[model samples]
Target: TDRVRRSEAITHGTPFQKAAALVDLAEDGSARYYFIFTRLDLIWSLNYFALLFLNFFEQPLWCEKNPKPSCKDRDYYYLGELPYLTNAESIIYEVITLAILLVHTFFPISYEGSRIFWTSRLNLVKVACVVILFVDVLVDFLYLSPLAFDFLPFRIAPYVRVIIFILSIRELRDTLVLLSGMLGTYLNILALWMLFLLFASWIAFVMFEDTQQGLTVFTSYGATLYQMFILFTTSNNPDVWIPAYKSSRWSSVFFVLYVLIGVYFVTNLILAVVYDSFKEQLAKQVSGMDQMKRRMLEKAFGLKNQCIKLFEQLTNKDEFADLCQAIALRFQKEEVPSLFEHFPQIYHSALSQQLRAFVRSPNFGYAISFILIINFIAVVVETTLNSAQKPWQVAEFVFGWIYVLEMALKIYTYGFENYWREGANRFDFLVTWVIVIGETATFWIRYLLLARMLRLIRLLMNVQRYRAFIATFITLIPSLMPYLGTIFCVLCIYCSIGVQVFGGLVNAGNKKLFETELAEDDYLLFNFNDYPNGMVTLFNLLVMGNWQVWMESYKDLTGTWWSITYFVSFYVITILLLLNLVVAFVLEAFFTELDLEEEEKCQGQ
Candidate 1:
């Protein structure tokens, strides 16, 4: 009973950091384990990432601590020197790290093994990494050696540890999953558009290969691709092609075709399509939330039904009315008192009526909307270095105070409930607080500028058409998911096959598998070496992003028949069927939304 009482009082340790500190003190066994796991895992992740960062910076474990060096070659500098975050000889760093690694090395083995028998393999994998690090540190300290066993070869351990930690957190895992899902739509848009880019590059290579001016730009197949990409992005108006055009008049045709097909039509058209689809995607996410809310409502109704059923079974039929009457009497007891009972008297008070009158006036909206516009414009205007100046600071301060006053006036006039009921007012309230806090806390108000500007959307929402579009898009989003999921699934399927057939084909000339007997190393790192690499490679295939290299390699090495059929079928399924079907779904949803809007208008009339 005493232990239970202490457990009940443990609510103060709701924040995990406090709970971590209370691990040994807590009476609850589960609480102690959970807190310890979270705290220790967090520390382990931080330590590993720190090591990875040091490795990434190409920092050696040992370096000369003293600036002064002896001229004698026999004994130049101290050997047991370590450079951590500082350049000084911080020998304590290695000792502290070794202590931590020793704890972590043994910690997970007992805890993880005792929990689940089947997870022995996973436990061993995790523990092996810890042991590896522990051994590395021990050897380094004992032998006075730097980078003992070369941590570079075991770099995969840090990545594995970090990825495991990230996946351990539910929210981060969900975000990654959703991001991978969204990548399907983006990749499809990229794939179809890049077809023209490839076409133009090939044409440039073939047409201008021999010419003096064009030879430099269109030197090789890869160089032609690079030149065409430059033309597409940087300067499009007759820069590269104009040089070739001086020699041959027909060369102008190539530039015109490339610009018209590659830049103007494909790029612009694809962008417009992608924007509209993404808007639909956002709407679908809202629909998903609504679906969950509906499910919750269903669960509540089910509980109510079950309670009524139990009451019916327990009581006689004639006694039901008496119970109902008792329930009515319970409500009449008026246990829940509300301020709404004296609403008229409070609302009609001198101060309240005057505030209401002022807030309701047309000038109120005009003044607030005008201030929002001016604030937004001030945020936009910038100096050469784009630094906020005194004028910007003054404007932000003045506008922020006005916004606060506006919020206070509205809340006072309408009352808290009435003001909060309106979505626009709620949005305004949040923005007001953010801006207020930013100013008062001496925080840089630059990020809060967006919050301030979004308040202007309240004015735009007044337009019936814009409101209708927003509503319609949100309604159609749930339907859009099936199409999105299909693309992702198909991409996944092809990726699986990609790894099976073309696995380790790219690394055939590297140290992992087969080494090429040549002075020049292999150029292509992109291959189906594993699942993750395969997934990315296939996604690249979806977009046809520098796909010629892969296509050429597979054709030469794997046989023409196999590679040709494989590549062709992938494009045929994705471009001809899957991608178009998604766009078709959006188009259908768009038209349906338009029809619904028209029906609503007619009914209103």
Candidate 2:
């Protein structure tokens, strides 16, 4: 799109200059709408924030156990009237939202042609959000107790809101088209992916059901599926898995097989889908696909000539020798240079240039990044030390002041617009301001200061490739949800089997037989009993950690020598299958985004 915009430019100019010129024309015609809506939206946002504060933070006094979250602790007694405030907050938000909608209705700007019922994704999201929110409130206040509503349907309310907010925002046509394409592609892939996971889960269920008969965690097929899902996440630590392996030598081999499959193949499959989707969408966005859409619209409106002529006026043509002046004066022609830039050329000394160069230098950026790393390590050290040996207070102050001075200097040198050019800089400014202002003012906002540690993450932006890679990785998160869901379904199946066979199948001791945490002899605690404990115990089994105990325990119950074969077979397939998939996932996203990041870096340079 940027390329397309430049090709249409009246004349060659710096990239920023050309963009500014185009916006100037865009302003002359469509910008009045942009400004008016921007202000209205800002006002609406402020009101939303105020209402959000009252509902979520300011005055919520309903019991956490009660239908509302109004408890100081877990105890249900509360003082505030949740019924009135929450309802009022909901009412105000929708009213403000509706008011904005009213403005759009009156304005009658049609980017797309008229829509029939159920035709538009935007409309679908709008309807879903309103209906779900209404239902969420209805279920919470009317039919069920807070506990029921909060636990199940309430958990899903957040997802509904995610789309609603996206629908609520006014996006460029380029973005909307890109989103439409991604959903189309992603949904198609999801069907095949689900089948693959289901096939894998079935195999896992059949393999391990009989082996861990006494294990509670592996009690049933449903439980097996859930446990399998958790293993796929790779969050089950070695302590849990190692013991399971110890129970059966074959379990070790089983894990190796699972690790190979999941940590390698499945993840790649998922990443490839998301990776390709992201790349394709991004290419379409940047390659001026948007211009064609606009061209079509203008032709349809029969204003092609007038719009082009207007665009020509804003373009920096050869007649406009002074680029900045041409942009500032609406092509009216001015003798003076623009004052909006950061560089104070007339007053700038050589030292100013050197300072600018140093700040912008790669090495300088690296140095700042390195210091932030040491800050994290130092915090860890101080937090561990006794009060007498603690140097945290002094270290904290030094780090705080260093960051403050760095921000102040940039602001003074770059001017506000240039200083805030990158949103990354703005974020840094926000974090620093919160730390300083929060410490000074007692507004119950100290928790935000904890965000200071988030500074370390910002340092990643110092490297061009890493920065872009992180962006791509973040974008991939939403797309990965379906794959994750598929894995969850698999896990539930595997867990069901585990629970049926091995639920509460622990070793009994001398007089009283009981389960112990990470039990070694005569007892294995990570058995599929009830769902919760069973899942945890099974989590250990997933890693093949000390899994021999489980095999031995199963053997003791069955009086059989084949426990090893049973446990090992289960281990080889289910756990290994999904976990490696996640690893492969990370690798794919990491590798693909680097190329994208590299391209972007070159473009920026």
Candidate 3:
């Protein structure tokens, strides 16, 4: 009795106590591995956050510490070679820390399941934080890294900065989520303050001509660093500080204009997108929570009803088999009430319905197809116009009509909501509108600008290149595995023959091309200049070129009847049989439907 009581006590402990014991046992066994992995992840997260914070604080101060006297002076002189954590030291430290963070970020540790995983909400928040940190690190590196800013041509730096700016957009999606909640909103305000400083610096770079004049202490655009500082804090009160500088009048005007464009327009545009994304995410979250609650209520009701029915049926065994058969038939017919129908909250939820609607909508495919077709027609028109007597004359007229039609369609489909949702869309729309109306309205007013009309026309057909590239890339995706396998097989055969046939004679030559140093015993006299060996080398290189070389090689090699027969047989089997089989296997794996009945049986166990 005592032994049984002890066993029951061990088995019936609270969940927390059971969990503690399991953890303790795991620590004693292989569970210690996960504890260490978690610790590393926590450390990485902290370090990444620290590095981003430190970099943001350090960039401006570093500029001040290493100020250029004038734009004419290209050299940037450090305040002092302080061994301690100076601004420069902080920047370098941040870069090293960030690089380490990036390396760790990309490398995930996988362990056996069913392991305890972080909730999706927690995972998303963590990933968002990490992504923002990464972006901060990237911006800092681009600005401060010697390899990027110092070594690269000064003229190319602006373009490089633009590319980096564009690529940073991947963070915009998650950052919007992080900024939606009250805590996220507060954090975003702080982030925005830092962003204001960064943008001010960019404005300073643009406005101050002397800032980029020479390679003095301000070698590149370091001269504008102070103006950037001022713009962030003193944009509104420019007059008070304006008269102090010789270039104050023009600088103030430029600074105000920049604030209007960059701060007001661009910032608001980004905020709009962020706002839309936040609303979408919050809606989804609310819907998901409602669904989950409804599911739990339904499950409880089901179990209770089932238990009652089961007890009643057991009492009446004479009708049990017939009753079971009727229940089964009802389930097969889906006449049994669904959990969703019983719960009003789940039934009213829009997320699942929205997802279904999205899947069923022809609008997405129609939009894509329309964009492609319109762009293709525009390209053909442009190409034909280019061959005319006055290429620019015809191109402009044709482009104007295309632009008008596209804008009309865009307005009908996307409407003003899209512009409100995306700043880039707004900018693109504004530009298109300005060119279509502004250029034509002022055609006689600024005839000189009319010559540049063709330049503006070119922008109307911008999607042509993008669509072509996307189509080509998408087509390549399905073929990648087979293409890779074929290339691998051809290379293997080519290298094997090359080594076997030309191992001796072409020692020096082979070493030059293939990175192999031949032994004295491996050298053969006939191997160096043999016709068959040369033919094999040529064949391999040709095969590497795929169709280009293969076609030419086939013509030469298949002239003889026996060679033709061998080539035809090989091609038929490899291309017709094997390649098709590989493709079919991939398609089946991807598209096959699961058996729900079997799945439900497994789940019941």
lDDT score for residue 99 of model 1? 61
For model 2 the TM-score comes to 0.47
Per-residue lDDT, model 1, residue 404, is 86
Shift in Å, residue 377, candidate 1: 13
The C-alpha RMSD of each candidate to the native structure, in angstroms, is: 14.1, 11.9, 30.7
Model 3 per-residue lDDT tens digits across residues 463-541: 5666434434444455345434443333333333333323232323333322221223222221212223333443433
Per-prediction TM-score to the true structure, in the order listed: 0.43, 0.47, 0.21
Q: Give the winner by lDDT.
A: 1
Per-residue alpha-carbon lDDT of candidate 1 for residues 494-559, written as tens digits (9 for 90 to 100): 655665566544432334223221112232444554445555667777776444445555655565
lDDT of each prediction vs. the true structure?
A: 0.55, 0.51, 0.40
Model 2 Cα lDDT, one tens digit per residue, 1-605: 34344334425454444444444444333334444555466655554344222222222211222443223322222122223335565556645644554454334233333454257665655666667755755565443455554443123333343334334433423344554666666656656655655655566667655564215444666555545544554545443345455566676565566656765777566556656675676677756744653443333233255445544544433222233235444544313223534467743777866887788777877787788888778755654654464345556667777789879667656766567766678878987786666544532422533555576667676667676666766657754554454444334444444545544333233122233323445233355433334445556666656555565556565556565555655654444344444555566677777777688799899
lDDT of 3: 0.40
